[PDB]
């Protein structure tokens, strides 16, 4: 059947200020079917107890979810989102970049 | 309030 691969955006809730607590978001959208695996990473390791939104969908029937967790950005710590979906042969990693 | 659908597809 016809499947749709997820769009991925990684970004902060508030403007990033080093040493100030914030929220790290990974927004996955545009995908079908609805099963999807999303991890937030801090220096390559999986953050525990990430929360997410309730499954819903857009006008074109594609699904979207928001995964989020508290985080404190620093100059050196690297953050990312790792997504797996039936459309992907390998997990997709998108790094957090405060300029996007 | 939601609607209740009783007729199947």
């Amino acid at each position: 059947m016809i499947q749709r691969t997820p769009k991925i955006q990684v970004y902060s809730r508030h403007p990033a200020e080093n040493g100030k607590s914030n929220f790290l978001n990974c927004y996955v959208s545009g995908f079908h079917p609805s099963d999807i695996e999303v991890d937030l990473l801090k220096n390559g390791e999986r953050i525990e107890k990430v929360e997410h939104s309730d499954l819903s969908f857009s006008k074109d029937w594609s699904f979207y979810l928001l995964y989020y967790t508290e985080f404190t950005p620093t100059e050196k710590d690297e953050y990312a989102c790792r997504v797996n979906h039936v459309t992907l042969s390998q997990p997709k990693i998108v790094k957090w970049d405060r300029d996007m | 309030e939601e609607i209740e659908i009783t007729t199947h597809f």
Partner: protein, 276 residues
């Protein structure tokens, strides 16, 4: 402005892993206010916005019973759909339905909706007349014949013109401090050198509600639609949304570029430039 109530139903079969999960979520505009999930330890219609919590136990019991019944209904419908497409009991499939009502600033019905999709493909839809159906294929024609015989369109018309609008108006009043408040975007332009020859100008809109927004770049007053990178509007997690639009510009030409923003929360539309 104008407003909508909408319910989003998703049912997903998973052969060998129990019975199909059913989840219903309810929205007023961009604000989710209820959820029901058959996979919850104790499935119940639950509040997801503060203003709905004042509804009494009768509301929660009645909507829970509706969802528990819809759960079985969508499971039987998934079995029927598998048959309509000659599909094996092997694979997983998805049934989605959305329905609800739109009203204008005066609270008056603009139009109603009831649409369904199977495996992500449009399947059957109530037409805008709330009286006739559009079926996508010969399988959906079976459903259409069944729904015509049972007068489903008439039931939907009665709900959408009555119950749906009456409850949307009620929600809008009970949550007026948020649902009827438009928060304007906080806007700024950033500059990201790429090379000696060019840089990215990025126009940001942050913290706005509802998600509807217009965000564009112009060069010398001419729209740059084809050359603009425009990310999907994305939720911040505090009810508001974010968006940006970016253009690649030759070094030294930054002042020919203007960013334009339109949104319901703004007193007037904004024009922005890079301010070095």
């Amino acid at each position: 402005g104008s407003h909508s109530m909408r319910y989003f139903h998703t049912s997903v079969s998973r052969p060998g892993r129990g019975e199909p999960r059913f989840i219903s979520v309810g929205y007023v505009d961009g604000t989710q206010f209820v959820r029901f999930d058959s996979d919850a330890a104790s499935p119940r219609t639950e509040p997801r916005a503060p203003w709905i919590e004042q509804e009494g136990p009768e509301y929660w019991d009645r909507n829970t019973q509706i969802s528990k019944t819809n759960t079985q209904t969508y499971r039987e419908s998934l079995r029927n759909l598998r048959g309509y497409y000659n599909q094996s009991e092997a694979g997983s499939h998805t049934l989605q339905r959305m329905y609800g009502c739109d009203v204008g600033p005066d609270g008056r019905l603009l139009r109603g909706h009831d649409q369904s999709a199977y495996d992500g493909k449009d399947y059957i839809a109530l037409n805008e007349d709330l009286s006739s159906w559009t079926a996508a294929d010969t399988a959906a024609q079976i459903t259409q014949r069944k729904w015509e015989a049972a007068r489903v369109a008439e039931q939907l018309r009665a709900y959408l013109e009555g119950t749906c609008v009456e409850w949307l108006r009620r929600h809008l009043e009970n949550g007026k401090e948020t649902l009827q408040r438009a928060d304007p975007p906080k806007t700024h332009v950033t500059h990201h050198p790429i090379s000696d020859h060019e840089a990215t100008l990025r126009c940001w809109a942050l913290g706005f509600y509802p998600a509807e927004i217009t965000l564009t770049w112009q060069r010398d007053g001419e729209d740059q639609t084809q050359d603009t990178e425009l990310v999907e509007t994305r939720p911040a997690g505090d009810r508001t949304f974010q968006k940006w639009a970016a253009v690649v510009v030759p070094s030294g030409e930054e002042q020919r570029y203007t960013c334009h923003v339109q949104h319901e929360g703004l007193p007037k539309p904004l024009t922005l430039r890079w301010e070095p």
